[PDB]
RNA sequence: GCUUGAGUCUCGUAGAGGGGGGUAGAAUUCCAGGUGUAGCGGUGAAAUGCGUAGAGAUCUGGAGGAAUACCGGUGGCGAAGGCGGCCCCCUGGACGAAGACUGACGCUCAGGUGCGAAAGCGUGGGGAGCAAACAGGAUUAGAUACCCUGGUAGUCCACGCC
RNA sequence: AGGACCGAACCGACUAAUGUCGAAAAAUUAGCGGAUGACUUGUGGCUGGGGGUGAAAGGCCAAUCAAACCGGGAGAUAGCU
RNA sequence: GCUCGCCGGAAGACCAAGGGUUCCUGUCCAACGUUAAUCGGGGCAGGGUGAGUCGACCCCUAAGGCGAGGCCGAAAGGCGUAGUCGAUGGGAAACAGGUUAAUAUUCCUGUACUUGGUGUUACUGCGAAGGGGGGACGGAGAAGGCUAUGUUGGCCGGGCGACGGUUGUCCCGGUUUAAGCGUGUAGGCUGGUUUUCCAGGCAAAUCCGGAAAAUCAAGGCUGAGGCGUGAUGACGAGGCACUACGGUGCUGAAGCAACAAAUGCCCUGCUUCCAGGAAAAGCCUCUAAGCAUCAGGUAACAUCAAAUCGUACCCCAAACCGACACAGGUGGUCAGGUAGAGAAUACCAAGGCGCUUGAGAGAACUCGGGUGAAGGAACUAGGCAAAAUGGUGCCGUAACUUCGGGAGAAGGCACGCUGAUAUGUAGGUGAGGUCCCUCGCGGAUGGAGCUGAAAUCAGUCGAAGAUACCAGCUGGCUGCAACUGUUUAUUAAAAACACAGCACUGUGCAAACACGAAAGUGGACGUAUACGGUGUGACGCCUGCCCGGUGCCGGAAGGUUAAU
RNA sequence: AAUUCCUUGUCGGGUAAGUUCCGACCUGCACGAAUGGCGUAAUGAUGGCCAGGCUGUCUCCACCCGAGACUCAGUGAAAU
RNA sequence: CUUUAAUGUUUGAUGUUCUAACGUUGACCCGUAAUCCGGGUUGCGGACAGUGUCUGGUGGGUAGUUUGACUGGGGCGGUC
RNA sequence: CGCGGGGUGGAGCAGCCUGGUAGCUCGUCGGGCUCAUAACCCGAAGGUCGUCGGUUCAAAUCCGGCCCCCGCAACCA
């Protein structure tokens, strides 16, 4: 449930941990693994391409499915696992034929229920079926872009997408941010709200709580030296300048929508 | 204190060795330079 | 021991009683498009505001949140607060009918516990209209009031507190 | 359970004295802080000069940093000594 | 050689890194050693490093490097696939004793083990760069069973003692044994076996995964240590024996029990929590293209091979790094006795050293300390420095508070030795005997021996019993910052930075942003409860008015407006 | 006030004596609500003040024990 | 000459549709046991996007430099 | 020492900038309305445009002296 620990040390006095009892308290499936080592935000040229990345725990990757290319095959869920490479819960669901595959654990699903994947399925939480065969106006997630990519929409905790229109070859959605956009109607989209919905209530508490999760301490711009940040300087906290990013562009209001090869599909920007 | 030299034969040969300078073009003329001056110790070697 | 106290059981009655989950229609707002044009809005009057970048008006489509016109009645239910579009699920009390049964098992009740409009507060969402604070325009001797144009919190929902 | 408490190894370096051509081109002595953690450490790699790294001091990048070192422009130039 | 003193979780003993003969022996003293020097890490000469089991090489991967083609880029060159390299990782196998001036898990003796080749005999289907299982794993915590090791006693050998006692509850020394094999325990894990079918595992499949039946309830896997064996062997105190007087030859008693107990092992366990905890090969196994009088595989036996390299010595230091024979720095393992909670500390065992200038004098002055009458911060920029407090158990403990604290608050009492309760208690451990048995490393039962807190009372000793080393100074008011933490290595450790939390804003994924002429990557194999920038910096109560100036967003009608 | 120039501002408390300090008056040279305002338990090798305790810090030093200084013998620099 | 109407003709700015350029960090197959890549089918976009050349704007993210002299020292003021 | 702006009925502001015409609110005198005051409604008077001189048809205006006032001046070792 949603609990707070009793204060022992100033740091434990603000710890709200998300304890889910139904989580699998054993070690996970073997064949669906692979080492997912990090590189601290450094690339080929090894420079820090993205800040605040480095350190953290050493963990492995579970090839969780989104594609759901298995068709017309019933599958019964078995274990609920909180994956270290997501923010939402995953569920070990065994496809009856003889293979286990990891899928995102939705809200209305017990690790012991039978889900079915295919257009022949009805409207029940956890089933993968096209939006054109879905009574538009429902609540889904993991919506694809390409008819065979997997689903890159609403893939986090307590997330979902409202379906607006279904005019022919296009299905207009209302994304989580409110971005009204059309997508190819023949694509796959799974039903149900994504579980692990109390993730946003998770307060970290101490400094280390964000440290072992990789995020490095952010050094402010007014803390930097005039040579380092475009801000810097100021003898006694003198800011007097318009906030910018460490490379020039004036932040706090400067839209960067420069695509045009895909600018056309949106109906409403986040406004 | 901590003096600036912690010897390690492999580390000394991994980035300063013979083949390391025989690895690319720039390092190649390094030996063209040292061969021109004619050092008995052509490179830090065995 | 007895029964006129009280309580229970059999069959039915009316109801905005409560909680949870769906759903409908009208209207308001916004957005997009077509027609079309100098006013629109407002008040005691006027002005701020909106408008020739083309509003308001009008037709069509879509998305929304909230309250449920008429029925509605000094009508009904509940301990009180309070509660009304419809449908389903679970559920509380009251009342009537002809009998049986237990046999004073009762009345109130400091302390204590629970419930408890609105406003307010914390966490996470939602956010049409309305509208503290606030701003502008007027009234005025002054108007940080009454009036008008906008408008944040809030108002709504789930879990706690007061 | 604890970025929990006291305190050795380990790591760090707050005070004082000694030292300053020292034992030492920042150490020793007597007291100190942390010490299951954002901890420390060995080995092996990757990021590089107007760039790298930075819990941000313009510190650190081989006793050298408000722009390393080595060689070449180059016997730069100097109204100065 | 006999005393003295020092370290003794090290200044001891072994390795890796790194050095490179500094190791051992003989000889020599000009040069090196901060002094002398027949001495030595110095000169000259000779000698020494013996491996199937150690490490590496080798097999296979990680970060990452390189990279046939390929994409891209003035050129150079950059990134990257297949592959191929790369440990700090995983993967076969040996220990004891003796010996040398110097090396030995390497030589010798004794006793074992591992992976392949060839051949023989008897059976039998084998077979991949392909599939599956295994390899294969986190932090912390608690408990049980043992071991390393130590103490006491028994036993054996020797002594009975240079100043009083000491044949006795006396003193001292020894009381050691591996790898492997067999047994398979304490403990942990898991329900086995049989039949049938299958859109599953890029193809196949008897292997795995799954779905139904059957039968029975155990089978299996794993596993420190003990016990036999290894071993009527070795070693072994002390004698016996010859000295170049350095040491060698020979012989050889006891060799067990009990208690305590590791951070070592079982444990690459078990419980629990969250931040969710390598890869590949070896190994076992199933089949594809196929090959079957074959070739190969399984088992037993005989025999052969195990190549190349390192192996000296130092290894918390006069041999590494610091110009030096430099009060500094350098990772890992082993690690006893008494006291002690402890790897703190003090004194010692093993073992190694007294630091490569000494001998006198005992002034001023300088440094490290001891003690101090009366006073006790009057000192000084300032209680800087010294002094003092300092342990365990128990008693008791405020303002305030986020109800966890504050707190070990403050402040106090008893602490030694001896006897008794009790010829040493509670507790712990536990043989013999007895009974039973699905007979073994068994279960109850039984209680000797051994070991051993603490509490009460009585008595006594000194001024003082946590008597040494060791080991908090405390309380009150208040500014700032939340706190832990980090930073100017080498004059500033803080109020600076970070911090969890909050807010604004950018971002629909070939995402923003960033490195990069480009490709390609990070972001992220994440996707709005997400990622990036900025600002502030817990929690509590709140965050008002201003859109004039600048920046930004939206709207574009009109004015103006480049190239064309 | 880490801010207050004038200033050691004014009043009260602490001391025999208080340019510092604590609590208040507002006359804010020149505080101010995320370059966040005001409180704040806990924490601190942090700044300031005070008290208890304790002592050579001081009145005022006195003695003693070691290492140098002094002498002798060997070796033998240095800045300038 | 102005206002204007049908047509021919000449180019341009918008709206929609289409597929062949092009894009494709969509699916699948083969080269090939290879997430690079190339080609082949097919789907979704679509003369957009993107790139070269010219060009206006913005632009301390970046680079090269200037920022006077006299002066009873300089700065400030003043002057030339 | 200097630089910038202003000086307008009893109070304070317009007009100046870009030359021919001097305005607004309060106030003063007064009335009405109320029983009274203020307020309110309404009309009129009230400005040498600080001062002198110059220039052009006309000077508040364009300019030059004198006086008054507000901010900054009384540093860097």
From Swiss-Prot, chain A:
One of its GO terms (biological process) is cytoplasmic translation. Residues 38-47 have a biased composition (Low complexity). It holds the Pfam family Ribosomal_L2_C. SUPFAM superfamilies: Nucleic acid-binding proteins (SSF50249), Translation proteins SH3-like domain (SSF50104). InterPro entries: NA-bd_OB-fold (IPR012340), Rib_uL2_dom2 (IPR014722), Ribosomal_uL2 (IPR002171), Ribosomal_uL2_bac/org-type (IPR005880), Ribosomal_uL2_C (IPR022669), Ribosomal_uL2_CS (IPR022671), Ribosomal_uL2_dom3 (IPR014726), Ribosomal_uL2_RNA-bd_dom (IPR022666). Residues 27-52, 220-271 are annotated as: Disordered. Signal peptide: none annotated. The modification N6-acetyllysine is found at residue 241. One of its GO terms (molecular function) is structural constituent of ribosome. Disulfide bonds: none annotated. Keywords: Acetylation, Ribonucleoprotein, Ribosomal protein, RNA-binding, rRNA-binding. Changing residue 229 to Q: Loss of peptidyltransferase activity in reconstituted ribosomes. No change in rRNA binding or assembly into ribosomes. GO terms for cellular component: cytoplasm; cytosol; cytosolic large ribosomal subunit; DnaA-L2 complex. One of the primary rRNA binding proteins. Located near the base of the L1 stalk, it is probably also mobile. Required for association of the 30S and 50S subunits to form the 70S ribosome, for tRNA binding and peptide bond formation. It has been suggested to have peptidyltransferase activity; this is highly controversial. In the E.coli 70S ribosome in the initiation state it has been modeled to make several contacts with the 16S rRNA (forming bridge B7b, PubMed:12809609); these contacts are broken in the model with bound EF-G. HAMAP family: Ribosomal_uL2_B. This protein can be partially replaced in vivo by its H.marismortui (HmaL2) or human (L8, from the 60S cytoplasmic ribosome) homolog. Belongs to the universal ribosomal protein uL2 family. Part of the 50S ribosomal subunit. Forms a bridge to the 30S subunit in the 70S ribosome, contacting the 16S rRNA. Interacts weakly with S6 in one of the 3.5 A resolved structures. In pull-down experiments interacts with CedA. This is Large ribosomal subunit protein uL2. It comes from Escherichia coli (strain K12). The lineage of its organism: Bacteria, Pseudomonadati, Pseudomonadota, Gammaproteobacteria, Enterobacterales.
Swiss-Prot record, chain B:
One of its GO terms (molecular function) is structural constituent of ribosome. Keywords: Ribonucleoprotein, Ribosomal protein. The keyword Ribosomal protein applies. GO terms for biological process: cytoplasmic translation. GO terms for cellular component: cytoplasm; cytosolic large ribosomal subunit. It comes from the Bacteria. Signal peptide: none annotated. Pfam families: Ribosomal_L34. PANTHER family: LARGE RIBOSOMAL SUBUNIT PROTEIN BL34M, MITOCHONDRIAL RIBOSOMAL PROTEIN 34 FAMILY MEMBER. HAMAP family: Ribosomal_bL34 (MF_00391). Part of the 50S ribosomal subunit. Belongs to the bacterial ribosomal protein bL34 family. This is Large ribosomal subunit protein bL34. It comes from Escherichia coli (strain K12).
């Amino acid at each position: 449930a949603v609990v707070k620990c009793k204060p022992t040390s100033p740091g434990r006095r603000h710890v709200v941990k998300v304890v889910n009892p139904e989580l699998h308290k054993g070690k996970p499936f073997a064949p669906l693994l692979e080492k997912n080592s990090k590189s601290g935000g450094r690339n080929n040229n090894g420079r820090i391409t993205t800040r605040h990345i480095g350190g953290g725990h050493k963990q492995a990757y579970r090839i969780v499915d989104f594609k759901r290319n298995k068709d017309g095959i019933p599958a019964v869920v078995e274990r609920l696992e909180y994956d270290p490479n997501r923010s939402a819960n995953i569920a070990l669901v065994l496809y009856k034929d003889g293979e286990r595959r990891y899928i995102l654990a939705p809200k209305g699903l017990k690790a012991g229920d039978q889900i079915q994947s295919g257009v022949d399925a009805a409207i029940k939480p956890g089933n993968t079926l096209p939006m054109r065969n879905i009574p538009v106006g429902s609540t889904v997630h993991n919506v694809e872009m390409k008819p065979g990519k997997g689903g890159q929409l609403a893939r986090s905790a307590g997330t979902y997408v409202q379906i607006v229109a279904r005019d022919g070859a296009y299905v207009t959605l209302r994304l989580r941010s409110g971005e009204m956009r059309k997508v190819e109607a023949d694509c796959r989209a799974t039903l149900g709200e994504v579980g692990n919905a109390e993730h946003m209530l998770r307060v970290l508490g101490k400094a280390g709580a964000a440290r072992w999760r990789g995020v490095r301490p952010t050094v402010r711009g007014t803390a930097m030296n005039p040579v380092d940040h475009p801000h810097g300087g100021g003898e006694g906290r003198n800011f007097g300048k318009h906030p910018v990013t460490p490379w020039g562009v004036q932040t706090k209001g400067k839209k960067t929508r420069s695509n045009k090869r895909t600018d056309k599909f949106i109906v409403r920007r986040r406004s | 204190m901590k003096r600036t030299f912690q010897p390690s034969v492999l580390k000394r040969n991994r980035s300063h060795g013979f083949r390391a300078r025989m690895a690319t073009k720039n390092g190649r003329q390094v030996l063209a330079r040292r061969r021109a001056k004619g050092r008995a110790r052509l490179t830090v070697s065995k």
